[PDB]
Amino acid sequence: GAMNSSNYAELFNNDIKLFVDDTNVYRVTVHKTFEGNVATKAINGCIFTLNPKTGHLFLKIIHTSVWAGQKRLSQLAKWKTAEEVSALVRSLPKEEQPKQIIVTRKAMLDPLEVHMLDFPNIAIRPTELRLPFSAAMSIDKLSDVVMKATEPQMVLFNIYDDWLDRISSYTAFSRLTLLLRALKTNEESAKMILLSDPTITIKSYHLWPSFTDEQWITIESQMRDLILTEYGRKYNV
Amino acid sequence: MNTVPFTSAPIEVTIGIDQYSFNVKENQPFHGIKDIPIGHVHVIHFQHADNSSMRYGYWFDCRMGNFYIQYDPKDGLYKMMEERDGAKFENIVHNFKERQMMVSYPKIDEDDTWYNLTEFVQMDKIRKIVRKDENQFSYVDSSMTTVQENELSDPAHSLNYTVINFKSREAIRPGHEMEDFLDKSYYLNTVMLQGIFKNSSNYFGELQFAFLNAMFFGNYGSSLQWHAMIELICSSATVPKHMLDKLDEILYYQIKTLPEQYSDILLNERVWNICLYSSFQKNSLHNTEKIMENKYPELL
Numbered sequence A: 001g002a003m004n005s006s007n008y009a010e011l012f013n014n015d016i017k018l019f020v021d022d023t024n025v026y027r028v029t030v031h032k033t034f035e036g037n038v039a040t041k042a043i044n045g046c047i048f049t050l051n052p053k054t055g056h057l058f059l060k061i062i063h064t065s066v067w068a069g070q071k072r073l074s075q076l077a078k079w080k081t082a083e084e085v086s087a088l089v090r091s092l093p094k095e096e097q098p099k100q101i102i103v104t105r106k107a108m109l110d111p112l113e114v115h116m117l118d119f120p121n122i123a124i125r126p127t128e129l130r131l132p133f134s135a136a137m138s139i140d141k142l143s144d145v146v147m148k149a150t151e152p153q154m155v156l157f158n159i160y161d162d163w164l165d166r167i168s169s170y171t172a173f174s175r176l177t178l179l180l181r182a183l184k185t186n187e188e189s190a191k192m193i194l195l196s197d198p199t200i201t202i203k204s205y206h207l208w209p210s211f212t213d214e215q216w217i218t219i220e221s222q223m224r225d226l227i228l229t230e231y232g233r234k235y236n237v
Numbered sequence B: 001m002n003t004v005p006f007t008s009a010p011i012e013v014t015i016g017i018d019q020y021s022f023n024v025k026e027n028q029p030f031h032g033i034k035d036i037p038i039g040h041v042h043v044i045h046f047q048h049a050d051n052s053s054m055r056y057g058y059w060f061d062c063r064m065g066n067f068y069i070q071y072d073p074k075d076g077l078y079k080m081m082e083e084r085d086g087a088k089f090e091n092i093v094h095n096f097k098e099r100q101m102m103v104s105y106p107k108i109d110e111d112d113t114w115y116n117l118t119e120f121v122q123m124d125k126i127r128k129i130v131r132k133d134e135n136q137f138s139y140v141d142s143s144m145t146t147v148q149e150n151e152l153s154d155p156a157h158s159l160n161y162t163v164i165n166f167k168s169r170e171a172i173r174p175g176h177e178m179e180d181f182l183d184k185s186y187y188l189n190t191v192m193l194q195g196i197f198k199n200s201s202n203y204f205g206e207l208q209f210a211f212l213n214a215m216f217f218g219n220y221g222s223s224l225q226w227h228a229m230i231e232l233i234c235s236s237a238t239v240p241k242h243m244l245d246k247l248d249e250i251l252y253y254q255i256k257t258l259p260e261q262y263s264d265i266l267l268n269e270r271v272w273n274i275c276l277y278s279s280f281q282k283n284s285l286h287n288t289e290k291i292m293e294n295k296y297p298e299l300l
């Protein structure tokens, strides 16, 4: 059933699974019209489909042309997400297909279940974890490829860079979710932390800076401080 | 007018005949039910005084044979049987009537309730849902499960209602996933009506039979079936106008007849609120919506 703190280590076992997050599929700017009414303008979005064991990220870019002439776009976005995830699964060799797909929002359950009827043995699961994957568009290289897209496109990344050479997937996921939680709570501060020291660079083939083990401990501490701070600045404590 | 003779009444029992019911005492000189209207299916049903567990009963049509009830002390229930000797039967009934040992089917002349509840119900379709080919009548009880319930365990004792499942390949055309899930018209009209039921009369007949088994026996799988068949119509944007008008009448009389004190268990809040207030047909069931709001405003 639902994925929660009690069954957290299941994410790092050897059953292939994918998280699917749809919070950046349908994105808009809200603006005034010449007549003083309000209107929306869509911008490019993305499906965030992530293997938490390996770090493999299947970033399906959603070009604004998919919304042209369509009604009820927030509803359509969930079904478009499920269509694209189903298409991804069918494109993978059988031995690479997931045994479970975990959706970060319960409104994705029925759309994905219906699109995956051909795969009765793939479990579609919700989660009680409040995962910060909406902040994926605060990762500069991901935001860049989404905004530059002129057509539908899939781009493959490893969201852990080379971390798995040195740490376990449990630890890599915890670092990732800490980084993304920070970026979600105070993007400016989080990005300052990550890039304050000009001698640490991001490799061309990476998403995050090339921190040593000791520097990651400092970085991770600074992100916890930020999250706690903002939690005070917010609630005043 | 036809008659169903009882050999005797050896155990105290509440007996139903259609929407009516009466109490019979242990070894009371009760010999059956007379003046049963020809032209309709009927149901004769039982609840023992000592074990209200297992309501059970028999669907029958007196045009199909001469039927009587006799208690079996080994299996512990009132059984329906067919008497093939027509002269023995007429002689049994005439004696019982002369001795005034029978209750009269107590139909008020103004009253169309039973017709309205069984308009599309046919014995031949009942006998395909309830499979026991050697009898002309059909046994149902509170515990019998449906074919769909069994897929989610004795197949011979099952209610073979038509399986309806909104998240199934039968319901959802490849490439029309969102369309078919949010508007079930293709599943209603092509798959079920044209394909399986053949016409709306057979669909309504199964819907009405499922409701009656839910009401008279508290049969939970029948209640599930009744609500699924309502929801499939209400969740379709394209439904023939005559079907909507007829559904409104069907449900009106069902809600009218329901015991007020059983609405908690026999009515699914989600289905009824969705059907009356959210669905494509939210504005198409005026009679049903009006009686529901005046009789069960809590559910909504």
Ligand SMILES: Cc1nc(/C=C/C(=O)N(C)CCC#N)cs1
Pocket: B005, B006, B007, B008, B068, B083, B089, B091, B092, B095
């Ligand atoms: C086949 C069927 N046997 C019966 C038996 C009825 C009964 O108890 N008796 C005593 C019959 C009375 C006279 N004559 C009804 S229909």
